[PDB]
């Protein structure tokens, strides 16, 4: 342990005591990485134990099991769960590995050396050494690069992953032809984030997802080798702060964007986040309602094309602002929704009402009626309707938990960016403890500023 | 004493025991505060735990009924008690405690002992500031929570048809009183609430800015990274650069405080002026002198069937609040609305 | 001379001797917040009415179309557009841009990108003046709440028509409809936000009065006491011991802050953390998480529903939602 | 020869608060006064 007057940090900022303590800081991270693996083991087995097969996966409050289901372990055609034992092996292999990570995290925090600079020169680092920092940055990009090739090997070779856009309904599909075209892969990145684009949250098939992870796997292996054999160039010396709290703040602003991206990823996308496992999206459940009452009222003898609404726009089918035949109602805002149950009914010129008066399939109205009663609105105590709804069901969508948790975590880590990037830029400048009171720089400025 | 040396009576033997520098100051005000404030808090914590509201309101409001912290309350009396003070020796209760609780008389127990508790607490901080020989600005600021309490809990129901339309003492019970004033009084539109928002939400700005401007213009008076250690309250110099603080905001916001005394009085002034103005608006709503309607936009929107503003949307939403809650919000009216006479949009 | 053209421009942008500091965040902020300011004033005064709801009824918000300061607003973008990007150049005519709520999305895109850079240069001048940085962290709480109402709640609900209108009575519509659909009053993060602005108004009056009631006698009764402070004096114009030693007898002695630096941190942290939660509470209800729903929670024997105050809030809630957007809904579930 | 003679002062910052106060009240209340 360590106290305040030997550091200048109180008990409430005492992890800042081990900034320049390389070995204690290593045990801080390995024990924390034990906790991420421990939670992923424990919350997996909690969700395996509380899995009920005669209920949907999204109804049971499961957020980790849809990730293993999206890889295609233990799922059948249409999102039916075959067996739960592949979800059990993923829970134990994290729960056992957490003890190994927990051991060396407790080891380097208590018994291992405080600074591993003089005894273990390969692992030792000073924060201002720009070669060693890029050296450690290069080691972990190769780990992230080889981790990104695990998803590609599992989709191309090791059984495949779940494709919700598969012909014949969604099941596990070996992705034999991943998209390696740079105009397609780097076309998502330069796409606008707004409606009809959705930056990278609209990636609509698994071939772009797996082919995009080929690109992110090679560039991180190549970019890792780039940073092992280079140092930052003099323009990068000129732009960055080279302290350990700066390197944290660089990571906090990068990861706070990623929390915002995965917030809008799980809310909007239904390819990497399949609706059989995560439930319908916000756009999916609202489009499912208009599709449900369109099939309800064709059977009750009504021309849903010629049916005029009370505003005069069209109760069931209206026209998109770019000219596509879409669903009417307040769900005109979600007209750029695409779904694997809905896209069989959709021709070039929007929806095809010839195809939609004669060829509504009975499985499509099964699935769209499921999505209407599992809309991602709920309550904080998991009630499950609009705020004007009685305590009947027990439901909040996983998409509603995944987006709300990761906007909040993405918001605070942007705040953590603003905290530490302000502090590390000021602590490197010398005035993070306060104004010097002898040369206050405002007193050497011209008044009437 | 008194620079003429009379002999001490029993008052002086009582004055120095009350004005004693013990752990908790009693004082002369504590003969009014500590019996009343303990029974407002004791009446609220008993009423939210055990006392029903099934007879005054037709709805359960205690932990023993099934309510939690958000929905339990000490609810107001029925509209049949008018403005009765509901003394337990009163003509309604007549000595029986278990019916005084059922008649909602424990509401007025909390409301009256809370009102004389606020007098006891405001006299407390005149009394301490005269012992400490300070200026009495802490009490003058507490006139504004007394301006809010008296105008809402006391003045407002006296102008209405009874103590029923008072706020009940709860969390969800305040929330309907809030939704009562939107639906019935259009109280967001009232310009005294608008000055009340700008005072309350502008004092929160001044609290956050003055806290952050001080904490980020501090002088480096210590060596370690804990800047809270580099302070002794018996120091004669300022702990933060006011000159740096002025030059910062004069270039960020264009206008900054240059006077430290005007700053802290402006932090005093904004929440007090905000609450005194909003207290005047609730005085106006006691008589139903609402700022409900802009008549020049009601004449136009009735003579032009396509003139829609966000104002006329708000008037339609208040019609929705009025007709859909008042079969259950006002059970004394005994109004039954058939479902076809309540207003209703399309398909909801 | 030796200095280039770009170097003399950098020493002018980062110059602390400008009257309003610019900084590198100000080369974004100033042309953004003069764009959004100019198009706000023109659209608050002279914009033609706007089909907010996408149902081809226009809603007037301009002073020249029969509105006053209270009821006037810059109307949000059309519901037919949704989250689509609708600049001026994606319209055919300028009047089609004005009809579909085009001015709103131009204000909101430049205002949000301007307050992110207002926060950036509050950092920057603190770094140029030798200050500690985190006034920007305090301003991140009204930035997040502005980001919640204009960006994140439209993103969650799928249209900029659900963003907050740029006006007084348009704000009130936004609040009333929000409470019907999400029950914001029963949400704990809004409860913490009210505790931040009621606490932040209590503490502004508390800290503001203890300092005012501890001023050293420097002036007479014929001149204001604000004359007793001199700007730039190095002595400290009030008695912190007398202020601490007054609030100590008022409730408890160890319930006060004898440390004025610790006092002003708590004075900053109570509103900022409270507004941080109600900015996230608004952003969790953006994804329809919603407020606590205790409707028909208390049930007696024989399975019959006892009402509570939450059931009365529901009667006020479902009165608004059967009347909000009264022509939009063709279908019984307001999922949008 | 009254000894109780005083002068009123109003600096420009108090002018700017006073002029702002009566225009913001006129921005606020005149919407109701013109009704």
């Amino acid at each position: 342990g360590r106290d305040q007057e030997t550091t200048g940090f109180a008990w409430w900022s005492g992890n800042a005591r081990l900034i320049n303590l390389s070995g204690k800081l290593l045990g801080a991270h390995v024990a924390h990485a034990g906790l991420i693996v421990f939670w992923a083991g424990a919350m997996n087995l909690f969700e395996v134990s509380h899995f009920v097969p005669e209920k949907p996966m999204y109804e049971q409050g499961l957020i980790l099991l849809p990730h293993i289901a999206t890889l295609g372990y233990g799922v059948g055609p249409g999102g039916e769960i075959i067996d739960t034992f592949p979800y059990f092996v993923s829970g134990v292999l994290h729960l056992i590995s957490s003890a190994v990570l927990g051991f060396g995290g407790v080891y380097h925090s208590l018994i291992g050396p405080e600074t591993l600079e003089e005894s273990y020169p390969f692992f030792g680092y000073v924060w201002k050494d720009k070669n060693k920092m890029t050296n450690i940055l290069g080691y972990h990009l190769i780990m992230l690069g080889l981790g990104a090739w695990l998803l590609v090997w599992k989709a191309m070779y090791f059984g495949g992953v779940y494709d919700t856009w598969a012909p014949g309904g969604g099941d596990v599909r070996v992705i034999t032809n991943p998209t390696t075209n740079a105009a397609v892969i780097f076309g998502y990145l330069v796409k606008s984030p707004f409606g009809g684009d959705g930056w990278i949250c609209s990636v609509d098939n698994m071939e772009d997802i797996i082919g995009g992870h080929i690109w992110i796997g090679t560039l991180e292996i190549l970019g890792g080798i780039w940073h092992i054999y280079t140092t930052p160039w003099p323009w990068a010396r000129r732009a960055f702060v080279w302290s350990g709290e700066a390197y944290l703040s660089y990571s906090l602003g990068a990861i706070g964007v990623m929390g915002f991206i995965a917030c809008c990823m799980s809310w909007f996308n239904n390819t990497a986040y399949p609706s059989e496992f995560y439930g319908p999206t916000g756009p999916e459940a609202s489009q499912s309602q208009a599709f449900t009452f369109l099939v309800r009222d064709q059977r009750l003898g009504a021309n849903v094309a010629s049916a005029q609404g009370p505003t005069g726009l069209g109760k069931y089918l209206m026209r998109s602002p770019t000219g596509e035949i879409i669903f009417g109602g307040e769900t005109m805002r979600f007209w750029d929704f695409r779904g694997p149950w809905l896209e069989p009914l959709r021709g070039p010129n929007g929806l095809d009402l010839n195809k939609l008066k004669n060829d509504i399939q009975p499985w499509q109205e099964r699935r769209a009626a499921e999505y209407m009663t599992h809309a991602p609105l709920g309550s904080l105590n998991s009630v499950g309707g609009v705020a004007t709804e009685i305590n009947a069901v027990n439901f909040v969508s996983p998409r509603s938990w995944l987006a709300c948790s990761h906007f909040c975590l993405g918001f605070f880590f942007f705040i953590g960016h603003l905290w530490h990037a302000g502090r590390a830029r000021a602590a490197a400048a010398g005035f993070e403890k306060g104004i010097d009171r002898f040369d206050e720089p405002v007193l050497s400025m011209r008044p009437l500023d | 004493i008194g620079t003429y040396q009379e002999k001490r009576t029993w008052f002086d033997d009582a004055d120095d025991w009350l004005r004693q520098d013990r752990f908790v100051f009693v004082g002369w005000s504590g003969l009014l505060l500590f019996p009343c404030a303990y029974f407002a808090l004791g009446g609220w914590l008993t009423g939210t735990t055990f006392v029903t509201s099934w007879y005054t309101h037709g709805l359960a409001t205690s932990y023993l009924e099934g309510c939690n912290f958000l929905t339990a309350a000490v609810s107001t009396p029925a509209n049949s008690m008018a403005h009765s003070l509901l003394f337990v020796w009163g003509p309604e209760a007549q000595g029986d405690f278990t019916r005084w609780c059922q008649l909602g008389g424990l509401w007025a127990f909390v409301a009256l002992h809370g009102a004389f508790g606020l007098i006891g607490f405001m006299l407390r901080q005149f009394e301490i500031a005269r012992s400490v020989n300070l200026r009495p600005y802490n009490a003058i600021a507490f006139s504004a929570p007394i301006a809010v309490f008296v105008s809402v809990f006391l003045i407002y129901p006296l102008g209405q048809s009874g103590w029923f339309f008072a706020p009940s003492f709860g969390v969800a019970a305040i929330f309907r009183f809030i939704l009562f004033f939107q639906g019935f009084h259009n109280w967001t539109l009232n310009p005294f609430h608008m000055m009340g928002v700008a005072g309350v939400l502008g004092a929160a700005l001044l609290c956050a800015i003055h806290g952050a401007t001080v904490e980020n213009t501090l002088f480096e008076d210590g060596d370690g990274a804990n800047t809270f250690r580099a302070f002794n309250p018996t120091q004669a110099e300022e702990t933060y650069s006011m000159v740096t603080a002025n030059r910062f905001w004069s270039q960020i916001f264009g206008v900054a405080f240059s006077n430290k005394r005007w700053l802290h009085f402006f932090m005093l002034l904004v929440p007090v002026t905000g609450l005194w103005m909003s207290a005047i608006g609730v005085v106006g709503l006691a008589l139903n002198l609402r700022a409900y309607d802009f008549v020049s936009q009601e004449i136009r929107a009735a003579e032009d069937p396509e003139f829609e503003t966000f104002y006329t949307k708000n008037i339609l939403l208040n019609e929705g609040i009025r007709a859909w809650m008042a079969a259950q919000d006002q059970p004394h009216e005994r109004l039954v609305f058939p479902e076809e006479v309540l207003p209703r949009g399309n398909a909801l | 001379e030796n200095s280039s053209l770009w170097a003399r421009f950098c020493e002018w942008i980062t110059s602390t001797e400008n009257r309003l500091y610019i900084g590198w965040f100000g080369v974004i902020m100033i042309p953004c917040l003069l764009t959004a300011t100019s198009v706000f004033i023109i659209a608050f005064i002279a914009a033609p009415p706007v089909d907010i709801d996408g149902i081809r009824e226009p809603v007037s918000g301009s002073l020249l179309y029969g509105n006053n300061i209270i009821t006037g607003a810059v109307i949000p973008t059309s519901n037919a557009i949704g989250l689509h990007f609708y600049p001026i150049w994606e319209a055919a005519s300028l009047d089609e841009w004005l009809y579909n709520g085009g001015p709103y999305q131009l204000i909101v895109c430049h205002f949000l990108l301007g307050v992110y850079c207002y926060m950036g240069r509050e950092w920057e001048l603190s770094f140029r003046l030798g200050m500690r940085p985190w006034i920007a962290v305090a301003y991140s709480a009204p930035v997040a709440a502005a980001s919640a109402v204009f960006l994140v709640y439209p993103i969650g609900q799928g249209s900029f028509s659900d963003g907050m209108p740029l006006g007084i009575s348009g704000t009130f519509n936004f609040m009333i409809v929000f409470q019907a659909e999400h029950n914001i009053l029963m949400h704990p993060f809004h409860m913490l936000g009210v505790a931040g602005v009621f606490g932040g108004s209590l503490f502004s009056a508390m800290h503001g009065s203890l300092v005012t009631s501890s001023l050293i006698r420097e002036t007479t009764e014929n001149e204001s006491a604000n004359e007793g402070y001199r700007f730039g004096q190095e002595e400290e114009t009030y008695n912190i011991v007398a202020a601490h030693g007054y609030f100590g007898r008022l409730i408890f002695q160890y319930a006060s802050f004898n440390n004025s630096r610790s006092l002003h941190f708590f004075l900053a942290a109570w509103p900022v953390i409270g507004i941080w939660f109600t900015a996230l509470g608004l952003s969790t209800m953006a994804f329809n998480l919603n407020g606590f729903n205790f409707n028909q929670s208390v049930v007696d024997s024989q399975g019959r529903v006892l009402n509570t105050w939450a059931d009365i809030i529901n009667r006020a809630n479902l009165g608004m939602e059967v009347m909000h957007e009264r022509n939009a809904h063709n279908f019984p579930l307001d999922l949008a | 020869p009254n000894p109780n003679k005083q002068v009123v002062e109003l600096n420009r910052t108090s002018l700017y608060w006073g002029l702002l106060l009566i225009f913001v009240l006129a921005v606020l209340f005149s919407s109701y006064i013109f009704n």
Partner: peptide, 30 residues
């Protein structure tokens, strides 16, 4: 007519903002 009065009150408020920044009483030190 009243919209002329509304803009005069809004221009007049933005006038005081302009004078309070660029013609403020300058804080004299010492």
């Amino acid at each position: 007519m009243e919209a002329l009065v509304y803009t005069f009150l809004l221009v007049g408020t933005l006038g005081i903002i302009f004078f309070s920044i660029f013609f403020r009483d300058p804080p004299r030190m010492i």
